[PDB]
Amino acid sequence: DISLHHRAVLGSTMAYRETGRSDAPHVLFLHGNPTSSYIWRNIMPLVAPVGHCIAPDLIGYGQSGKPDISYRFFDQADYLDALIDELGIASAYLVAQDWGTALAFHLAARRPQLVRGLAFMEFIRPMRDWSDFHQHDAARETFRKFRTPGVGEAMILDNNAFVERVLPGSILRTLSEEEMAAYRAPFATRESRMPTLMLPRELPIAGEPADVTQALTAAHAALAASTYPKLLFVGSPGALVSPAFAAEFAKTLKHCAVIQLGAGGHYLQEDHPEAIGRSVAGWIAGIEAASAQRHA
Amino acid sequence: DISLHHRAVLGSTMAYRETGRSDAPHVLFLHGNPTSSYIWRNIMPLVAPVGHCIAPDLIGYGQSGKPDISYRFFDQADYLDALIDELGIASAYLVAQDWGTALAFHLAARRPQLVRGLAFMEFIRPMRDWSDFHQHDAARETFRKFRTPGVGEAMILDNNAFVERVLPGSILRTLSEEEMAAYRAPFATRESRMPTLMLPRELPIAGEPADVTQALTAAHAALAASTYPKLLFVGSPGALVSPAFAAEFAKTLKHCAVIQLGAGGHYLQEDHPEAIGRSVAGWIAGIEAASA
Numbered sequence: 001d002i003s004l005h006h007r008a009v010l011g012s013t014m015a016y017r018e019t020g021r022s023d024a025p026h027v028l029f030l031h032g033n034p035t036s037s038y039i040w041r042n043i044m045p046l047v048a049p050v051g052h053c054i055a056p057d058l059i060g061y062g063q064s065g066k067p068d069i070s071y072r073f074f075d076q077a078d079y080l081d082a083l084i085d086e087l088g089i090a091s092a093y094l095v096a097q098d099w100g101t102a103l104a105f106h107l108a109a110r111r112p113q114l115v116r117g118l119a120f121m122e123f124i125r126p127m128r129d130w131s132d133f134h135q136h137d138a139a140r141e142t143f144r145k146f147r148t149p150g151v152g153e154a155m156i157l158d159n160n161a162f163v164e165r166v167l168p169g170s171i172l173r174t175l176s177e178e179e180m181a182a183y184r185a186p187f188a189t190r191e192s193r194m195p196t197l198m199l200p201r202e203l204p205i206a207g208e209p210a211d212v213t214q215a216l217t218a219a220h221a222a223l224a225a226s227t228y229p230k231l232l233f234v235g236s237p238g239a240l241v242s243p244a245f246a247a248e249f250a251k252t253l254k255h256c257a258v259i260q261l262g263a264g265g266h267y268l269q270e271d272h273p274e275a276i277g278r279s280v281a282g283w284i285a286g287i288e289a290a291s292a293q294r295h296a
Numbered sequence: 297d298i299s300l301h302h303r304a305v306l307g308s309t310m311a312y313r314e315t316g317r318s319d320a321p322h323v324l325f326l327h328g329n330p331t332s333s334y335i336w337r338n339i340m341p342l343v344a345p346v347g348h349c350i351a352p353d354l355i356g357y358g359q360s361g362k363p364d365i366s367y368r369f370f371d372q373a374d375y376l377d378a379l380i381d382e383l384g385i386a387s388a389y390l391v392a393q394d395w396g397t398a399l400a401f402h403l404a405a406r407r408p409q410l411v412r413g414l415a416f417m418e419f420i421r422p423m424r425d426w427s428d429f430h431q432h433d434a435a436r437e438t439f440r441k442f443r444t445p446g447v448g449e450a451m452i453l454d455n456n457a458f459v460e461r462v463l464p465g466s467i468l469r470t471l472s473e474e475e476m477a478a479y480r481a482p483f484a485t486r487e488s489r490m491p492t493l494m495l496p497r498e499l500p501i502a503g504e505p506a507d508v509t510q511a512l513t514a515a516h517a518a519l520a521a522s523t524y525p526k527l528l529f530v531g532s533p534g535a536l537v538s539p540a541f542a543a544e545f546a547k548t549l550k551h552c553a554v555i556q557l558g559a560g561g562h563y564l565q566e567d568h569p570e571a572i573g574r575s576v577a578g579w580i581a582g583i584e585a586a587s588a
């Protein structure tokens with residue numbers, strides 16, 4: 001009862017997973033790099049009783065198409081918007097991680113009416129310099145290498161280091177070979193890996209690239225002035241988001257609850273699917289109940 | 297992280313567990329029979345980031361006092377009202393189970409602006425006859441015996457059967473020795489066990505006792521008219537509330553969502569702490585955000 005579907009969008013196709021009844025509010029689950037909707041498989045069933053769950057594979061990821069495009073942040077945003085409009089989604093809760101949070105922020109910034117509430121974790125923000133990126137020097141060095149011409153191509157295009165090393169390296173439990181197999185399956189060819197190389201090159205570090213830095217600064221400003229309900233999950237030590245940074249960040253926002261998942265790195269869904277799922281489903285039930293009173 | 301505190305109330309004393317920051321909305325956790333605030337120990341920490349969490353030990357339970365009172369439903373209600381006033385709790389989320397739910401409904405009926413939300417499970421309602429009680433003849437027979445003069449006294453006062461038999465019998469997992477010790481600590485003496493016997497005798501079954509039946513009937517009607525959000529947790533098969541009954545019951549109320557927990561009996565917090573606390577915290581966060 002989680003089904004997979006394809007729709008033609010722009011110059012390609014996109015796939016998504018869907019579950020829950022269709023008369024409930026839309027809930028869009030947005031993955032990051034280098035995962036797919038697969039990452040939300042144990043969480044969607046917990047949200048399905050209160051929401052119509054849709055979990056897209058980003059263009060170039062999962063079961064979505066592999067068009068010949070730049071795979072920049074703005075391309076990812078363009079294809080996700082086009083899937084959303086093709087599905088008729090005018091109002092939704094957003095649930096997101098990594099580049100999925102950049103996409104969510106940027107989406108809420110452009111369409112402030114759409115957002116019924118945002119649940120997010122391990123998010124991206126403009127980073128003034130490298131010390132603002134991640135929690136350990138080994139991760140900075142890896143991403144500096146990804147961002148280096150030739151070197152990055154060799155690590156990710158030739159050796160698939162993002163899927164084969166970064167991903168399992170930032171998850172606490174050991175993934176089954178079935179699980180890894182699902183994570184590597186979209187990236188069997190050298191060229192198919194390109195979107196996984198483009199994204200770390202789009203991370204806004206020390207003002208480069210400038211277009212994404214600008215876009216994510218505007219989206220963080222809009223997030224900060226937003227009034228919709230918000231839920232920030234955080235792991236210890238986390239990766240992009242330490243616990244102390246979470247508390248600090250949360251108080252630049254309105255209506256942002258901070259939920260502690262405990263021990264975790266960057267991909268929190270594989271370590272805490274139950275906690276995330278129950279938290280989000282309860283949150284939606286509360287927002288929907290409180291909004292029905294109020295509007296009565 | 298969870299601290300234990302004490303307050304003078306009505307010439308005696310009441311204990312309570314506390315966590316969260318005080319700038320947060322009050323969340324009042326209400327245990328039932330024969331447990332204490334101890335039963336919320338794995339849930340409260342999950343709710344702390346969004347709420348100023350307070351879990352009382354009812355009068356006669358946990359580390360609360362043991363005054364010479366009859367320990368009827370109305371006595372528990374008066375002592376609880378008094379603690380609430382002593383702690384300055386004027387607006388709260390209520391989280392509740394068993395006789396804590398009777399207390400929560402009754403409180404909400406008499407103080408309709410107090411309640412910001414009600415999360416509840418395995419709740420008590422006026423039961424027209426014994427077939428509306430629980431889901432097995434053997435549970436009906438046990439409480440019938442509790443309610444019978446002399447027989448109830450021997451089971452509970454002498455043998456401590458509510459604590460030693462009914463409690464662990466309606467929890468799936470096996471309690472550790474440390475956990476059982478904590479549940480029996482307040483009931484070492486024969487006299488101390490009186491409250492755990494008085495509450496089964498207060499259950500409203502076939503109009504008896506009539507005063508509690510009236511009180512809860514009226515609390516149930518206030519619950520049906522009420523507009524605050526509600527979150528009903530259900531176990532499979534449950535004890536007092538089956539999944540089937542939870543579904544019909546929710547549809548009588550406004551803005552009630554039902555969360556299915558899966559395998560459990562009467563005391564859900566010992567089998568589903570993580571699910572309950574994570575849901576309740578998300579819910580409170582959501583309601584706070586949506587109301588403002």
Ligand SMILES: [Cl-]
Nearest residue numbers: 031032035097
């Ligand atoms: Cl992800």
Ligand SMILES: [Cl-]
Nearest residue numbers: 033199200203
């Ligand atoms: Cl990346």
Ligand SMILES: [Cl-]
Nearest residue numbers: 327328331393
């Ligand atoms: Cl209880």
Ligand SMILES: [Cl-]
Nearest residue numbers: 329495496497
């Ligand atoms: Cl009882």
